[PDB]
Design a protein around this ligand. Sequence first.
Ligand SMILES: Nc1ncnc2c1ncn2[C@@H]1O[C@H](COP(=O)(O)OP(=O)(O)OP(O)(O)=S)[C@@H](O)[C@H]1O
Ligand SMILES: Nc1ncnc2c1ncn2[C@@H]1O[C@H](COP(=O)(O)OP(=O)(O)OP(O)(O)=S)[C@@H](O)[C@H]1O
Ligand SMILES: [Mg+2]
Ligand SMILES: [Mg+2]
Ligand SMILES: [Zn+2]
Lengths: 339, 432, 432, 432
Amino acid sequence: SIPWIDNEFAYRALAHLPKFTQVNNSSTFKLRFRCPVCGDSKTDQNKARGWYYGDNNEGNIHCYNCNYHAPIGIYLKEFEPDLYREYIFEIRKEKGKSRPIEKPKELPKQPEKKIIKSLPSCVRLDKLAEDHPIIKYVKARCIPKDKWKYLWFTTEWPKLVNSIAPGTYKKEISEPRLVIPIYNANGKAESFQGRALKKDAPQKYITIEAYPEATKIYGVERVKDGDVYVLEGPIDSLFIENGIAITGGQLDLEVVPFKDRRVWVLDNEPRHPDTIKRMTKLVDAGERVMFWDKSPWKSKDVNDMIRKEGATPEQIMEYMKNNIAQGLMAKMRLSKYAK
Amino acid sequence: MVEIILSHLIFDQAYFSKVWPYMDSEYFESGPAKNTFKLIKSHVNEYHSVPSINALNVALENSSFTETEYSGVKTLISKLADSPEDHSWLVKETEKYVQQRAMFNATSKIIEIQTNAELPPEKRNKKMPDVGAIPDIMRQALSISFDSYVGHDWMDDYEARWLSYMNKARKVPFKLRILNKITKGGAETGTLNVLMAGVNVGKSLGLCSLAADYLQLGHNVLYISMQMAEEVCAKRIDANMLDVSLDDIDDGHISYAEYKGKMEKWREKSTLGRLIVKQYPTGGADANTFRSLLNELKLKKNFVPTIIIVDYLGICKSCRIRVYSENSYTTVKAIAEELRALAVETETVLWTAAQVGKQAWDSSDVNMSDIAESAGLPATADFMLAVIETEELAAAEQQLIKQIKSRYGDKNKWNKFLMGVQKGNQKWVEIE
Amino acid sequence: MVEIILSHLIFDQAYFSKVWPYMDSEYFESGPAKNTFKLIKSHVNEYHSVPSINALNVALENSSFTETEYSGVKTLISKLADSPEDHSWLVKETEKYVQQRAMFNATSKIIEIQTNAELPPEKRNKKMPDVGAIPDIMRQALSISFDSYVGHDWMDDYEARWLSYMNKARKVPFKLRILNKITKGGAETGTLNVLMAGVNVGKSLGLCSLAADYLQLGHNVLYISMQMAEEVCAKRIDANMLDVSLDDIDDGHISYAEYKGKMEKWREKSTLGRLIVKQYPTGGADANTFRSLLNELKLKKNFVPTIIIVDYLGICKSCRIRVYSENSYTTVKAIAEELRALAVETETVLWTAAQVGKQAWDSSDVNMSDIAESAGLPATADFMLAVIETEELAAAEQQLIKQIKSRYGDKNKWNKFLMGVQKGNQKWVEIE
Amino acid sequence: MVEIILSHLIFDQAYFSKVWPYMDSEYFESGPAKNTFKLIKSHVNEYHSVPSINALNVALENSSFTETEYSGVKTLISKLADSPEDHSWLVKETEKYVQQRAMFNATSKIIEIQTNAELPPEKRNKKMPDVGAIPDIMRQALSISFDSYVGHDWMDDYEARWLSYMNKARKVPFKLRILNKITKGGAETGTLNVLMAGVNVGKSLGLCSLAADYLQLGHNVLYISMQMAEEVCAKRIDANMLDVSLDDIDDGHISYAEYKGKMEKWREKSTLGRLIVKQYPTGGADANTFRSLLNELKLKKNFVPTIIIVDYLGICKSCRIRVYSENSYTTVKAIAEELRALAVETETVLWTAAQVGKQAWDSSDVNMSDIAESAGLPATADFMLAVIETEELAAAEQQLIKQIKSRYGDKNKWNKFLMGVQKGNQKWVEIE
DNA sequence: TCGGCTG
RNA sequence: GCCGA
DNA sequence: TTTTTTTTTTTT
Ligand SMILES: Nc1ncnc2c1ncn2[C@@H]1O[C@H](COP(=O)(O)OP(=O)(O)OP(O)(O)=S)[C@@H](O)[C@H]1O
Ligand SMILES: Nc1ncnc2c1ncn2[C@@H]1O[C@H](COP(=O)(O)OP(=O)(O)OP(O)(O)=S)[C@@H](O)[C@H]1O
Ligand SMILES: [Mg+2]
Ligand SMILES: [Mg+2]
Ligand SMILES: [Zn+2]
């Protein structure tokens, strides 16, 4: 196919549609829009189910509201016959010639730009009194005290962010959150996560990046010799020696260092097929993945094991060190464990 | 001018009665206009009448659609209104718009065809025509005018029929007077003709002889051989057209000088056509194969045949039949029907061959009930001939023809005429 | 479409005359529509005449409801206009609306019945029916329609059937006294007729003779031919209408003045219909193709056929069966059934032809068991004639057309009858 | 692809002399490619020779070019290499690029024509072609092929056909004077041949011998055997090649020393071909398989066959036929057709065996009618030799071979011949 | 109340 | 539509 | 790729 022309024509033919948004991440080109086939919902104007994905080898317009998935050419034929003919002609026009899109291959990225120096409205956990409510909550979390020097407590999280990244929130409503600063390899904070307190925070539990190129892996500065264990929760990583945690919905293997010795320690849910998908994509790369297939505990995360089933960190480490499998060996445990 | 066309489709009887039958859903757009015409066409199919605006916007529009499409259709219908416009300019502009949109659709389709073909196989979206049939589609878009030409009215078109009579613009005469006197002028253009001889009684001596005869008459001949190689058929053609024994070409009694001189002498004549010989594997060519071959010959060699001689109908295959059937009747009849469809499409006399039954071998006479491949082939054939030289005519270098079937004339008038075969030269001469 | 229904109840008369018996106040709504229909029904009950708008206003004034719904009712009756729609679409749309609303009412009723059943008997309603009645009431909503006649009652409809006996209303004369004598009035409308004969025996000759005879009897004849080309069929017709032999045509033995004079002499007759000859590829026409052809012949010209002559049904294709998916029997039976369905839909005599088995091509007698292709063709055909030719018959230019099947008369009264055939003129003559 | 085409135009003689006649300045681009080809055309016109790279640079030095055009042309000239690619791929790829660019140019031209048409006629370009020529233009697009070879064109390839005649480019000798006498040079390539075994003849033996004789002539042979094991067929081959009696191999009279000595003596001769025996289960091998086997042999063993001897036709399987039977006419007909198609597509001689009826068994004279698989096999078998063994011939160690069907030559020239069959040696020798 | 989510 | 806040 | 009904056709 011709994905770049597909993206260009999709942008041309979807910009005028209401609730259009050109969501362009460094590897993905997507368009959000209210689907003209269905119209989505009057309440769900911003919750527009019309999506276009052009990052694939072909451009596909999919709407989950009316369940309409189709190639971009079909949409052009059904809605923009003039633009349809334009696209269908120009695709053949450039089809004969060699693809030149690789010629302007430039990187607009930048190095550390918003290096985080100090945290207003934040008091570190080890600096707090033993009867602080957050301290009691983390006692319930059973986090070892020595690592409390890595977590802060705040009450002005929107204010803190707008002091770091102004304009994030139109209102700086005071909000207590657990600020977990995410540092780089050299030890300087490149982002920070406002972990929700109590059962759940009111809104917007998100990790605020200092800049788009900031790291998403927590604890990299504390990585020592030996195998590196990759987990899903920074608090969970706090229970793991040489344990880093990826912070984000995107899982890129290239950005994660220690290709030789990185070990993926994921959740203990054989169900939740997205987990199985992640496991499969990791094993297809021949990566080192830990398997909970022989775990005596049946909780979800390591901290859950500790809190609910009374697991101890040493048991966790010995299970991880004895349950690392790679290649076909990993695939066996993956296959048996999934269901 | 879609709004005007629809407004005068709904609010004008004469305009509808004039322009509707040529109208189609693929003419207006991909928006509200197409859906409005869809509703109009649905109502016309259901009730054989032009609906009013009330029928459309209430009884019809209230069906499966989308909010955007419903709003657009309602807006368009509310926008429809009768306007006094002369009923000569309206029809002309409608015809021009229909022609323009037909050209637009044809161009889009051929571009899509090129894109599809450029894509490699296994994703080539079968049922889409190849690049070879790009021009005719565009030509189809050329002749899309509002000309009520459906069928051949017996009374309204006697002049054209008389022109066809007086020109005799269907007959392709033979080089033999004997066949012309029984076919009343020769074989006709869109016809499928069949030869039956048996085993090693003819059936390719006759086809090669007819190919040579049509060649000496300046006609384009395409000899599609299934049971013979590209060179043996050309060798029989050489034996016919050079007055040289076929054995003499093999042993070497003919020098290269004689052959080259005879060929150049034939070339210098202005009454010599082109005998293009093409071979396909036995059982591996259908009517689609022959259509592709005709398209290729037209494109590359600028060779549009008037005679197509297939060496054997029975060892062809059916394009429509997908699973090969052990039943000979249906298979052979389908092959013959496809061949006749090709012949009437290209207006080319399509000669071919059929195998006679085992009982007819070494029989002094052969009736039509001796056809072996299928009884359906004589049903869709146009002119069948039979070769019945048993032993005596072989000794006298003769061949008797019975003319088992004839659509060109009463087959009983000249039932037997004892064709003068010459096997060494692979030709036919009369016994005048 | 409640607005349309109410407006045409108030203003139209025939629509009220037919649709009023199948009307109930529950069909419309519980708002303005229900009150409007209640006013209409009350007015028609008091004075047995459809009211006027002024009558509706007076009824609103004297008989009033609550003001909140009174305003809605009064503003609902301000849009009922004359709007002279067509009658067929209006009746069909009213039928669809009442059927849909009856289904909705029945579904809501059964839901209410089940809900009442769920309640304890202490607090359950008594007016609602019991659960065992849920099926039958659904039937009561399933069979709601405006067809006052479900079928033909033998005693209740002794009238309206005697009319079909005085005026034949089905028979079409044959122009051949022998055919009428063996048919008692000729071929009936909405029926499929078959001429069955072997290869080159005269199936198309007989079809052309019948088409010409019908053309002389002021009948629209549509000669849909799959095997022969339009010009060939036209020539075979001209050989009959112009009384000039085919040899006289192919030898240029008729002056163009003679041809034009004879054609215009036929044209000047007021007892001459129209003959349209249409060509389709062999095996490329089905029932829907014929339906499209009929639609385009009705639209593009004022030509509605009364006789349809298909050249050969066997070389057609089934409109339901995928091509060559089933064997000869099933496919040909489906083709025959589709053709007969077309005939009954158009109320037109559909003549056609069929081949016989390979065994009967040299048989002095042809039995029904020799029908080629399906054996269901005689089952679905309405009148079958076998055309038989022998050397003795050919010696005097005659055939042996014999009644194989007949739904028009006792086939044994005149089973076989000699019918002289002038092949040169392609004409049928009766021995007298 | 433009860079490769220009580079191989500059730095080649065969590729230029092959593909120059089909190159136009509009085929490449509107930039560096077009200007470079313009320079090439100018140089080849002013001096009738392909420019060198420095010659092209000089032409760039002295020419009308803009600064950007000058830089682009200079860079492209410096980017031209003398890479020695293969020839066939280069021709095919440049032809594909030319055809694709021609299609793009024609599509752009017709689109611009249609855009010009939809303009006020007072304001239009006169030079633009009219709409009616659009189907012609696309035809000119598809009339682009570097090598225009579609079928054997008479009167245009008389020299090549005569060269094939003199060179005997189709015949393959038999190492037996009698067979070459009855075949005018032996069997031909792309053909099928069958041996009709009579009452106990040993279908394997003849195919065995021919297999041998073909081996001694240096031809690559592949004996696909069904009813026998690879070792048994190879043992018969050893019997024919080493003059060792077959039963002597079983008994052990011939020792390992003598066997290996004879094998190495045969290996010393440079006039010895290669024989590849491959076994397949009875009825588990159709023609399509054989194609895969040939692919494997060519890919792996580099063995390109010219003779393919299949052990038994009746034992074989039809390529696409579900129903299988031990002796059925439809199956043998399909098998013969598929095997001949394989022979044609492989340009190889194919041999097989078949059985005849009991009437052929009892009678010394065998007719084509007296064939179990007549009409079927005779139709698709180029050569047919009836091998009959009689008691008197058994006493004389001979067999009566009769040329039942010879597409190669006249049947009656030398029909019956006595053959010196040695069953123990499995050998055929001539008779003085 | 928001964003991101395969076919 | 499902998930997260 | 078998398997069974039915019909139709064809070959021996
Ligand atoms: N090279 C030749 N020299 C002389 N006569 C030949 C030659 N080739 C074929 N014949 C004659 O041509 C006849 C053979 O039939 P053909 O005309 O080749 O077609 P056909 O063989 O009958 O078709 P089929 O399907 O193979 S049976 C016999 O009468 C042969 O004597
Ligand atoms: N064009 C013609 N000129 C002269 N006589 C003809 C012509 N066409 C047919 N005939 C004669 O009329 C007879 C029957 O003709 P047709 O009805 O056309 O054949 P048919 O009954 O349609 O058989 P089919 O359908 O081709 S298997 C032939 O056997 C000829 O004797
Ligand atoms: Mg032949
Ligand atoms: Mg006919
Ligand atoms: Zn949608």
